[PDB]
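Budget justification note: compute hours in this period were largely spent on complex prediction jobs such as the one shown. Inputs:
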Amino acid sequence: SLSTEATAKIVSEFGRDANDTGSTEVQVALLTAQINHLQGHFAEHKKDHHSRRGLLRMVSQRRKLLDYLKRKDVARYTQLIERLGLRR
Amino acid sequence: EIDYKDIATLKNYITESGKIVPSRITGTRAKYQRQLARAIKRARYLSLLPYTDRH
Amino acid sequence: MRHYEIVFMVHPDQSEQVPGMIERYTAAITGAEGKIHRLEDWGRRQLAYPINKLHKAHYVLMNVEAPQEVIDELETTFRFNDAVIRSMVMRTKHAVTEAS
Amino acid sequence: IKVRENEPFDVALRRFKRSCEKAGVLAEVRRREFYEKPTTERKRAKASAVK
Amino acid sequence: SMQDPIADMLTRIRNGQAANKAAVTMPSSKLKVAIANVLKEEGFIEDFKVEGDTKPELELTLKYFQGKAVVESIQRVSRPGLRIYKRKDELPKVMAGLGIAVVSTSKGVMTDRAARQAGLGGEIICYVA
RNA sequence: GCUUGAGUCUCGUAGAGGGGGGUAGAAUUCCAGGUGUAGCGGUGAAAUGCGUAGAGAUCUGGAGGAAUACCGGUGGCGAAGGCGGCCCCCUGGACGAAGACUGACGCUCAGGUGCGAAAGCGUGGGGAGCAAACAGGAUUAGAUACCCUGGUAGUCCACGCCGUAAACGAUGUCGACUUGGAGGUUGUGCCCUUGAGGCGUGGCUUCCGGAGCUAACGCGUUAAGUCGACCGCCUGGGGAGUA
Ligand SMILES: [Mg+2]
Ligand SMILES: [Mg+2]
Ligand SMILES: [Mg+2]
Ligand SMILES: [Mg+2]
Ligand SMILES: [Mg+2]
Ligand SMILES: [Mg+2]
Ligand SMILES: [Mg+2]
Ligand SMILES: [Mg+2]
Ligand SMILES: [Mg+2]
Ligand SMILES: [Mg+2]
Ligand SMILES: [Mg+2]
Ligand SMILES: [Mg+2]
Ligand SMILES: [Mg+2]
Ligand SMILES: [Mg+2]
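Corresponding output:
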């Protein structure tokens, strides 16, 4: 559900050291990554209504986590959505 | 159980007819009765065991 | 890289092609740097029921580690090929050896 | 289902039929489809078979 | 969801009591303590105890008189959904005087007997008789 | 600021959870043929129906659609609907064992959005069995039925509609607290593994039963007990879930 290899690489890319796994910035990027992947899954199929529930969930989460960060460090926030590429 | 190729261990989990045997007979655990079925089914598909005494 | 059990059954008459097939499927798999953890040319075995008419048939067990891609083309060539009367690529969960 | 029963005995000896087929799966499939009502039917094969 | 701790106290008590249970624990807080005090001071329980530093832990010793428990009724009165504030002249007196009402005033968490004397008012936390 | 609420990370485990593609055997109907001969079929009894253009019965070879016996189970999975042959691909959740990160980021939620059995509608397709409608045969005082012989939509696939069910546990969601017993299920720690085990410690579930609660029936650590947060809803029957 998103390779150890890749998942690790992003923790490596968004938090302090690896191990800083649960950093706000990092979860958002970890989710982002899966979400974007998933698009191709639901492209084909589209009827996979159950799996879709998990994906929406995915987004409910990120959205919530992204709002929290904003309230904290709107710098870490702005940096983040530029970096991932969302909000338009 | 461990494997479908084990037509040996397998053949004492079916009747003359070929029908899988309930767990209430074999005393088999739960988890394994499934492993057992899923491997008898495999055996059946690879003509390694009849579905039917009709053959 | 995923493992699979994999076993097919070749039509008796076309028995003599079984070698060339194994040779081939192997060069195919190894070709993409995939290991070949077990191989067993069970030969002509007798069938539980008759299938496609005709009884007995040439078996081939063969465990492998290879990308979900060569596994694909394998499954189809088993269709493209009329000599193989059944196949079945299976589970995974790490390699295996000897059994039977 | 099958009985060889070789030499000495003209008694049928096929009590094997009362071990599967017959009114087994054959009274079952004989008629009304069912569909979800067997659920209820078998929920008495256990509301009983508890004791 | 753990949005009212004081109710959880009032109830960990209430229950543990009706379960003729000698002890009772829970995560602590200044507010829990100040109440445990009044409960001891006014003598509805033997004595309390907070054991820990990182994650503090209230511990209360339940009194039992005859067969019965000493706390005949412990009930929240203010709460998150709906908060209560009586002045001084309007403070409540439980069981006509018997038993008591915990109330937090600007000068600490006292009883109604107290606050009346103190001459001031507050948020009537709960009732206890 | 804190770390216990809540998240993230590693490794696994069980599963009819979802979407897609392949594929198997048994049966039915049908087409062709071998043998065979006057009945088959159906009922309560009958008749319509089928058979001397050879039926039914039996054997063989095909075609096609639909569902997957046994396993199978107060078994499992999903938010509800609901999900059972086997295999691969894609994918959602749940759980457990270690510790490591985040540091209250939570709960609930009018409006909103999505999902949503069967029937039903639109277009093409598909159609073996079943079967509203309709047809015939019976029963009966009547028989627009219940039974019988047929049988169309439909039931099947794709795409899109509809948005309802006793859609029920007739019991909203989340959290904390409160005696027990016998199971089923599924993780995981330990033990001469020396037993097919011995003691623990999680998630899930079935049956009893204690306080308590209840009008009573009953519920009862999976509460209908003791408490809190938020939401939905009720206010005599009929009229009406109608105008
Ligand atoms: Mg507070
Ligand atoms: Mg057939
Ligand atoms: Mg035939
Ligand atoms: Mg998964
Ligand atoms: Mg919808
Ligand atoms: Mg429909
Ligand atoms: Mg239609
Ligand atoms: Mg009819
Ligand atoms: Mg309704
Ligand atoms: Mg129900
Ligand atoms: Mg119990
Ligand atoms: Mg009970
Ligand atoms: Mg409650
Ligand atoms: Mg209306």
